[PDB]
């Protein structure tokens, strides 16, 4: 039973803004690395590794991606890799793409999961064979095999953002723990890794994430089941939930083959430098793997690739690792080193280019000094212009004469934060930052954050939780039933008996007006504030205090509260008849409250106060008037 032809799922959308604002007018997969689009690199890697069917999922600027793909080498009838483009505006993550893959049932056997910005020459045959053997020996256990590359932690192709640390069972190459070390100085590994394997639990920090996976259809099934899932979320959830589901993730480490993902500008620069210096052989600039007539060149000494129809000025020096696109014109006495220049560029005289990447159509005037800067399509630089390291000029951006743009400066034709906040008042190009005849806007740390710039008495807690809950209920007009739900949930959670339940209830209810109250203690104002709370929240009292002798407990709580707050003693009645009017207390309970005087002396004067004489008379006046009602 031979396996079906190998298939690949290519995600042409990064689903993030790591290339803002360059991605405002161009998809990431179409950015030229060494004058060749990234998606071309990924498709060449897939075709070389033996992939016969490729599903390209495009969401952002899918029209441009489709237009570029249709003219590519891999959309020709002679190609052994059939490219099928699936586009949708409802893609927001790799999870959506994999859920759609599962819904369409595109893949029947193990496939390759890669992004559209992966540059690699890895042959996946060995890893695929190991994955198939593992799945044959243990049925439906191992579901994914990630591809890693041996590297030192100090290599330039290892940015802190994408650095990972992996705890691995070295005997079977099984991933036990996977973590990202961004912003961390101390890596924590759960002890649960050291449960079964008592010998190999190698903690590896020398693995570079190639972002290539060999995935069984179970990966898509699990992405469908867990609709909240990126790949890192999937890996973390699989490693955590190994008890519930016996799925495993393994890894394959390559040492002699190159593989990397262009996920930011720093990684872009590192990968471009590696590509120019033949680290991804045979994917070299002269190999012309895209089979395009305008991307052919000859490779001379010192890794200098020169295209056709390239004119070099007298006295110009190309030091090393320089790729010149076809039709480029370079002036006299220039010094270009470690730089990639796209086709159609125009370089003036006495221009210094060091570690810079100029895309198609860039015009640079004489006397410029550019270091570690990226100049996108049709950008222009005037005379006496110096670009400090990590300076980006996007498409159709002109920088005026006699400027020195500082490090980290990004200039784009889009307004810096206008539409960013708007996600109308045309803002003029400030000559103080872009110069005369300069077209563009300075893009500050609003978008620079991910640009080329980097290296017990539990009764009291019951009381305060109830107080907070009723505060939120008051603010949100929470219904009485929902409130009762909340205090009931708290009561079960903290294991509070019923007596304490209405003790705390009356306690908090009575101090609620005093939380926002200062101490000009006016009884009438206190009653006015308390009345809406009593009438709106009355069902809580009615359904919480009803049986026998619970009314006495509530009355004792009221007596304690008001013996603490003596200054409001005038509003004894304003509380008693308010509690009466809502059927919180009955006549027998209120009459038996003062029947016994076992309390302290103050309680006695709380039964015969200035207003309490009249109200204790009314306690029998209402009894005799009860013939009329109730």
């Amino acid at each position: 039973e031979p396996p079906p032809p190998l298939q690949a799922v290519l995600v042409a959308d990064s689903f993030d803004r790591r290339f803002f604002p360059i991605s405002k007018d161009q998809p990431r997969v179409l950015l030229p690395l060494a004058n060749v689009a990234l998606i071309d690199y990924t498709l060449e890697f897939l075709t070389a590794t033996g992939v016969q069917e490729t599903f390209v999922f495009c969401c952002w600027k899918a029209a441009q991606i489709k237009e570029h793909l249709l003219k590519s080498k891999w959309c020709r009838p002679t190609s052994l890799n059939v490219v099928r483009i699936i586009t949708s505006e409802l893609y927001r993550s790799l999870g959506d793409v994999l859920r759609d893959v599962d819904a369409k049932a595109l893949v029947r056997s193990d496939f390759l999961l890669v992004y559209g910005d992966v540059i690699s020459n890895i042959n996946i045959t060995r890893a695929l064979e190991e994955h198939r053997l593992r799945r044959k020996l243990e049925k439906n256990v191992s579901v994914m095999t990630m591809i890693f590359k041996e590297s030192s932690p100090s290599h330039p192709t290892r940015c802190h953002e994408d650095n990972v640390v992996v705890a691995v069972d070295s005997t079977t190459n099984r991933v036990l723990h996977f973590q990202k070390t961004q912003g961390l100085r101390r890596f924590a590994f759960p002890l649960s890794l050291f449960q079964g394997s008592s010998d190999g639990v190698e903690v590896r920090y020398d693995l570079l994430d190639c972002h290539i996976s060999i995935c069984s259809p179970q990966v898509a099934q699990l992405f469908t089941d867990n609709f909240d899932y990126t790949r890192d979320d999937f890996v973390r959830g699989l490693l955590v939930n190994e008890e519930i589901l016996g799925n495993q993730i393994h890894m394959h480490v390559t040492a002699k083959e190159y593989g990397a993902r262009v996920s930011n500008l720093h990684m872009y620069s590192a990968v471009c430098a590696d590509v120019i210096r033949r680290w991804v052989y045979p994917l070299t600039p002269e190999a012309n793997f895209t089979d395009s007539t305008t991307q052919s060149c000859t490779h001379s000494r010192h890794n200098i690739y020169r295209g056709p129809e390239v004119s070099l000025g007298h006295g110009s020096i190309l030091e090393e690792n320089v790729l010149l696109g076809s039709g480029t014109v370079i002036g006299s006495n220039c010094f270009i080193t470690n730089s990639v220049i796209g086709p159609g560029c125009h370089i003036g005289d006495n221009v210094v280019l060091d570690q810079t990447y100029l895309w198609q159509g860039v015009r640079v005037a004489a006397g410029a000094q550019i270091h570690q800067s990226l100049l996108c399509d049709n950008a222009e630089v005037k005379e006496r212009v110096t670009l400090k390291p990590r300076s980006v000029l996007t498409s159709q951006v002109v920088v005026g004469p006699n400027i020195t743009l500082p490090e980290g400066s990004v200039i784009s034709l889009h307004p810096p934060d206008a539409e960013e906040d708007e996600d109308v008042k045309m803002k003029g190009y400030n000559p103080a930052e872009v110069g005369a005849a300069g077209k563009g806007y300075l893009w500050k740390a609003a978008g620079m954050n991910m640009e080329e710039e980097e290296e017990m008495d539990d009764i009291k807690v019951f009381q305060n939780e109830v107080l907070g809950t009723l505060q939120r209920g008051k603010e949100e007009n929470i219904s009485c039933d929902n409130l009762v739900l909340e205090i009931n949930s708290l009561k079960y959670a903290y294991n509070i008996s019923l007596k304490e339940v209405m003790q705390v209830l009356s306690h908090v209810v009575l101090e609620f007006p005093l939380q926002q109250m200062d101490s000009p203690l006016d009884s009438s104002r206190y009653c006015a504030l308390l009345l809406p709370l009593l009438k709106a929240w009355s069902p809580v009292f009615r359904n919480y205090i009803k049986r026998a002798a619970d009314h006495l407990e509530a009355l004792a709580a009221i007596e304690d509260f008001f013996l603490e707050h003596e200054a409001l003693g005038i509003s004894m009645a304003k509380v008693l008849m308010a509690f009466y009017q809502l059927e919180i207390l009955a006549e027998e309970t209120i009459l038996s409250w003062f029947s016994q005087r076992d309390t302290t002396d103050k309680g006695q004067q709380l039964r015969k106060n200035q207003q309490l004489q009249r109200f204790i008379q009314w306690l029998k006046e209402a009894e005799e008037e009860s013939s009329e009602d109730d």
């Binding site: 927001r92 609709f227 589901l245 949930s489």
Partner: protein, 460 residues
């Protein structure tokens, strides 16, 4: 279609006469649902295993999906001995669903043949998805409860408060408490545990409930549980007259590899019946059926029309199916659409008698603020429920219909939820919400479907 059971005839069948206590229906399938609100390692599964024996499951997939969410069912037949000489509760006996309607007494109860009384189904979930499964929709998910507390620990355990909060939120009035694992418990220990239990349930819905002590492993006092199911648990009201509806929970492809053409079968869809009676040979519509996308990526739904080839209830074969258990409808749908539980989340009903297909909902949610019955140990913010945020994936649970949803906008309390897949529902239905706190989905509120974006089901 199976011997030693009551005959079922479609011709001699009337929907109006049908009752939950009908002998013909009970003889083959369960009619009432009694969810067991317990906990693993406390005998939650052991109690059900002792009551209902050991199942085998007619159809099972090679891969189990959403095992932590699946609403498992277990059918059990409860019988009463007609001989008055035999003392209660020994006259009441529990057994499997494959037993004949009458069997001779196996005990020296001086003769007397047992007779079938009721057929129950235990709605057991590995977690608490029951809560938002049944907490506002109501429907007919269950009408009883089996609160389980073990005996080795001391009430209230930290795993008990959530159970009581669940019992309260479900608005269940019929709850029976089963004190399990009390075999290795002293009499004084059992008495003080019962005192703690009654103190904990004081003032709650479990006030007037039995506290029956049982031993699941040794099968002790199970007959008391059967007796209280007979007497304490009332007969729920069910509507057998409306057009049948079934929420699809399982889905199988029954064709074994390397089978002959004549042996090919259609797609078997397991599910739960809400309101109505399904008949063999009845035309059925499954919605939203086939969900696909256009060339530009526009959702479109084609409902699947088919005919009921057969009906199954565990190991029994039915001619007509009624609510009160997990019924598997074997149909004429292609096995491609019903393989590996790919039809879960669809509504199967009479033709032209199904709700509308929605892609987005506009709900009026009331957000909870602390997890129900959870002890906040150390981290005070762990039990706190944060407010809804944009681009957050919740779990909308309309009855037994589970579906994901991304919150697109919240104005004051009206939240728009973009479902991962379109679902069949009607405006004004009670839905619930869940959020992935850690390793689990936990209920965080509920709401009503004020409005919603509907999709027109294309039919060819």
């Amino acid at each position: 279609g199976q011997p030693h059971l009551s005959r079922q005839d479609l011709t001699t069948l009337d929907v109006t006469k049908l009752t939950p206590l009908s002998h013909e229906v009970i003889s083959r399938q369960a009619t009432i649902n009694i969810g067991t609100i317990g906990h693993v390692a406390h005998g939650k599964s052991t109690v059900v295993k002792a009551i209902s024996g050991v199942h085998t499951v007619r159809f099972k997939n090679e891969l189990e999906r959403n095992i932590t969410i699946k609403l498992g069912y277990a059918n059990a037949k409860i019988y009463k001995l007609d001989d008055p000489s035999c003392p209660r509760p020994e006259c009441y006996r529990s057994c499997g669903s494959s037993t004949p309607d009458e069997f001779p007494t196996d005990i020296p109860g001086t003769k007397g043949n047992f007779k079938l009384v009721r057929h129950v189904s235990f709605v057991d979930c590995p977690g608490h998805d029951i809560l938002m499964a049944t907490m506002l929709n109501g429907a007919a998910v269950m009408d009883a409860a089996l609160l389980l507390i073990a005996g080795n620990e001391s009430c209230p355990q930290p795993q008990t408060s959530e159970h009581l909060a669940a019992i309260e939120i479900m608005k269940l009035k019929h709850i029976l408490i089963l004190q399990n694992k009390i075999d290795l418990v002293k009499e004084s220990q059992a008495k003080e545990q019962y005192e703690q239990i009654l103190a904990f349930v004081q003032g709650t819905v479990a006030e007037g409930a039995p506290i029956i002590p049982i031993s699941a492993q040794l099968k002790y006092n199970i007959e008391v549980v059967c007796e209280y199911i007979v007497k304490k648990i009332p007969v729920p009201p069910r509507d057998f007259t409306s057009e049948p509806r079934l929420i699809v929970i399982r889905s199988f492809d029954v064709n074994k590899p390397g089978c002959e053409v004549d042996d090919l079968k259609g797609g078997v869809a397991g599910g739960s019946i809400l309101k109505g009676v399904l008949k063999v040979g009845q035309e059925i519509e499954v919605r939203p059926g086939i969900v696909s996308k256009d060339s530009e990526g526009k959702l479109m739904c084609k409902p699947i029309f088919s005919k009921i080839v057969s009906l199954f209830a565990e190991h029994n074969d039915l001619q007509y199916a009624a609510p009160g258990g997990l019924i598997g409808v074997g149909t004429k749908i292609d096995p491609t659409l019903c393989r590996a539980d790919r039809m879960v989340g669809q509504v199967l009903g009479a033709v032209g008698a199904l709700p509308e297909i929605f892609t987005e909902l506009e709900i009026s949610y009331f957000l909870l603020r602390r997890l129900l019955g959870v002890r906040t140990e150390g981290d005070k913010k762990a039990a706190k429920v944060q407010k809804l945020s944009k681009n957050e994936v919740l779990m909308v649970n309309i009855g037994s219909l589970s579906t994901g949803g991304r919150v697109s906008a919240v104005k004051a309390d009206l939240g728009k939820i973009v479902l991962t897949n379109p679902v069949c529902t009607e405006v004004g239905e009670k839905i619930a919400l869940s959020r992935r706190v850690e390793k689990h989905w936990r209920l965080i509120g509920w709401g009503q479907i004020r409005r919603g974006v509907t999709i027109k089901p294309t039919v060819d």
